[PDB]
Design a protein around this motif. Structure first.
Motif, PDB file in Angstrom:
ATOM      1  N   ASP A   1      82.021   7.890  -8.998  1.00 24.24           N
ATOM      2  CA  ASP A   1      82.195   6.517  -8.590  1.00 24.24           C
ATOM      3  C   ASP A   1      83.603   5.797  -8.795  1.00 24.24           C
ATOM      4  O   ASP A   1      84.158   5.221  -7.841  1.00 24.24           O
ATOM      5  CB  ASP A   1      81.041   5.754  -9.185  1.00 24.24           C
ATOM      6  N   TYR A   2      84.166   5.802 -10.022  1.00 22.22           N
ATOM      7  CA  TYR A   2      85.434   5.091 -10.252  1.00 22.22           C
ATOM      8  C   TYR A   2      86.398   5.444  -9.133  1.00 22.22           C
ATOM      9  O   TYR A   2      87.090   4.556  -8.617  1.00 22.22           O
ATOM     10  CB  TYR A   2      86.071   5.350 -11.640  1.00 22.22           C
ATOM     11  N   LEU A   3      86.416   6.738  -8.765  1.00 16.50           N
ATOM     12  CA  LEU A   3      87.343   7.240  -7.779  1.00 16.50           C
ATOM     13  C   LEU A   3      86.979   6.624  -6.441  1.00 16.50           C
ATOM     14  O   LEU A   3      87.822   6.065  -5.753  1.00 16.50           O
ATOM     15  CB  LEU A   3      87.345   8.744  -7.737  1.00 16.50           C
ATOM     16  N   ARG A   4      85.714   6.630  -6.082  1.00 13.72           N
ATOM     17  CA  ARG A   4      85.371   5.929  -4.866  1.00 13.72           C
ATOM     18  C   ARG A   4      85.793   4.451  -4.915  1.00 13.72           C
ATOM     19  O   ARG A   4      86.049   3.839  -3.879  1.00 13.72           O
ATOM     20  CB  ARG A   4      83.867   6.033  -4.626  1.00 13.72           C
ATOM     21  N   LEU A   6      88.523   3.210  -6.282  1.00 14.65           N
ATOM     22  CA  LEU A   6      89.950   3.233  -5.928  1.00 14.65           C
ATOM     23  C   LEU A   6      90.045   3.366  -4.435  1.00 14.65           C
ATOM     24  O   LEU A   6      90.692   2.550  -3.775  1.00 14.65           O
ATOM     25  CB  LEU A   6      90.641   4.368  -6.633  1.00 14.65           C
ATOM     26  N   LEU A   7      89.315   4.343  -3.904  1.00 20.60           N
ATOM     27  CA  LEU A   7      89.233   4.562  -2.464  1.00 20.60           C
ATOM     28  C   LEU A   7      89.074   3.271  -1.653  1.00 20.60           C
ATOM     29  O   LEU A   7      89.772   3.056  -0.684  1.00 20.60           O
ATOM     30  CB  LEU A   7      88.127   5.564  -2.125  1.00 20.60           C
ATOM     31  N   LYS A   8      88.171   2.387  -2.054  1.00 17.84           N
ATOM     32  CA  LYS A   8      87.944   1.190  -1.252  1.00 17.84           C
ATOM     33  C   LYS A   8      89.045   0.147  -1.421  1.00 17.84           C
ATOM     34  O   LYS A   8      89.409  -0.544  -0.481  1.00 17.84           O
ATOM     35  CB  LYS A   8      86.552   0.601  -1.528  1.00 17.84           C
ATOM     36  N   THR A  45      90.657  13.987  -1.402  1.00 14.29           N
ATOM     37  CA  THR A  45      90.799  15.373  -1.823  1.00 14.29           C
ATOM     38  C   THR A  45      90.022  15.662  -3.090  1.00 14.29           C
ATOM     39  O   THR A  45      89.061  16.446  -3.099  1.00 14.29           O
ATOM     40  CB  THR A  45      92.225  15.658  -2.015  1.00 14.29           C
ATOM     41  N   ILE A  46      90.410  14.977  -4.150  1.00 12.75           N
ATOM     42  CA  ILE A  46      89.736  15.112  -5.428  1.00 12.75           C
ATOM     43  C   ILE A  46      88.277  14.512  -5.469  1.00 12.75           C
ATOM     44  O   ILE A  46      87.471  14.902  -6.317  1.00 12.75           O
ATOM     45  CB  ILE A  46      90.626  14.530  -6.504  1.00 12.75           C
ATOM     46  N   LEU A  47      87.948  13.594  -4.555  1.00 11.29           N
ATOM     47  CA  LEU A  47      86.590  13.269  -4.234  1.00 11.29           C
ATOM     48  C   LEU A  47      85.813  14.481  -3.734  1.00 11.29           C
ATOM     49  O   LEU A  47      84.599  14.611  -3.978  1.00 11.29           O
ATOM     50  CB  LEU A  47      86.613  12.182  -3.185  1.00 11.29           C
TER      51      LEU A  47
ATOM     52  N   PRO B  27      97.325  13.480 -13.926  1.00 12.12           N
ATOM     53  CA  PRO B  27      98.679  13.295 -13.413  1.00 12.12           C
ATOM     54  C   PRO B  27      98.669  12.667 -12.060  1.00 12.12           C
ATOM     55  O   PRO B  27      99.472  11.777 -11.782  1.00 12.12           O
ATOM     56  CB  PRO B  27      99.318  14.677 -13.516  1.00 12.12           C
ATOM     57  N   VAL B  28      97.766  13.091 -11.179  1.00 11.92           N
ATOM     58  CA  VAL B  28      97.862  12.486  -9.860  1.00 11.92           C
ATOM     59  C   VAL B  28      97.634  11.044  -9.943  1.00 11.92           C
ATOM     60  O   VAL B  28      98.312  10.299  -9.265  1.00 11.92           O
ATOM     61  CB  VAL B  28      96.807  12.888  -8.857  1.00 11.92           C
ATOM     62  N   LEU B  29      96.609  10.641 -10.695  1.00 12.94           N
ATOM     63  CA  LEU B  29      96.356   9.191 -10.855  1.00 12.94           C
ATOM     64  C   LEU B  29      97.627   8.344 -11.259  1.00 12.94           C
ATOM     65  O   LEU B  29      97.922   7.207 -10.778  1.00 12.94           O
ATOM     66  CB  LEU B  29      95.229   8.988 -11.872  1.00 12.94           C
ATOM     67  N   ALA B  30      98.362   8.946 -12.173  1.00 14.39           N
ATOM     68  CA  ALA B  30      99.501   8.308 -12.711  1.00 14.39           C
ATOM     69  C   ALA B  30     100.618   8.397 -11.711  1.00 14.39           C
ATOM     70  O   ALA B  30     101.413   7.540 -11.667  1.00 14.39           O
ATOM     71  CB  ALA B  30      99.888   8.940 -14.001  1.00 14.39           C
ATOM     72  N   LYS B  31     100.687   9.425 -10.888  1.00 12.10           N
ATOM     73  CA  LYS B  31     101.616   9.342  -9.781  1.00 12.10           C
ATOM     74  C   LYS B  31     101.268   8.184  -8.853  1.00 12.10           C
ATOM     75  O   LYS B  31     102.176   7.503  -8.331  1.00 12.10           O
ATOM     76  CB  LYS B  31     101.802  10.660  -9.023  1.00 12.10           C
ATOM     77  N   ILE B  32      99.986   7.900  -8.633  1.00 13.10           N
ATOM     78  CA  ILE B  32      99.781   6.706  -7.847  1.00 13.10           C
ATOM     79  C   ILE B  32     100.281   5.446  -8.517  1.00 13.10           C
ATOM     80  O   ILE B  32     100.966   4.640  -7.863  1.00 13.10           O
ATOM     81  CB  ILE B  32      98.486   6.582  -7.021  1.00 13.10           C
TER      82      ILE B  32
END
Ligand SMILES: [Co+2]
Ligand SMILES: [Co+2]
Ligand SMILES: [Co+2]
Ligand SMILES: [Co+2]
Lengths: 48, 48
Positions: A1-4, A6-8, A45-47, B27-32
């Motif tokens: 979820d957290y990632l989704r 960010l997605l929105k 991708t990571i989703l 790392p990817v998160l932090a690159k964002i």
């Protein structure tokens, strides 16, 4: 979820910039778009 | 205003990523993050 989540935000943002560029034609604005697009892909991708 | 409206989305986003990185250390998160920081500056700049 957290990632989704960010997605929105990321997709809602690319809308505001998309509209903004529908009227004023600033290069910087459009440079931001491509940062979020790059972003958006890394999200899904990571989703998975 | 529209620009200030980008400003707040951008600041609300850098919060979600900031929290996410407070727990998972990708790392990817932090690159964002650093893309939005770069962003945030360009916003205020042209905000004046
Ligand atoms: Co409209
Ligand atoms: Co982004
Ligand atoms: Co908290
Ligand atoms: Co941004």
């Amino acid at each position: 979820d957290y990632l989704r989540e960010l997605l929105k935000l990321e997709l809602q943002a690319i809308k505001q910039y998309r509209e903004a560029l529908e009227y004023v034609k600033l290069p910087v604005l459009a440079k931001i778009l491509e940062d979020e697009e790059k972003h958006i892909e890394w999200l899904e991708t990571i989703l998975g």
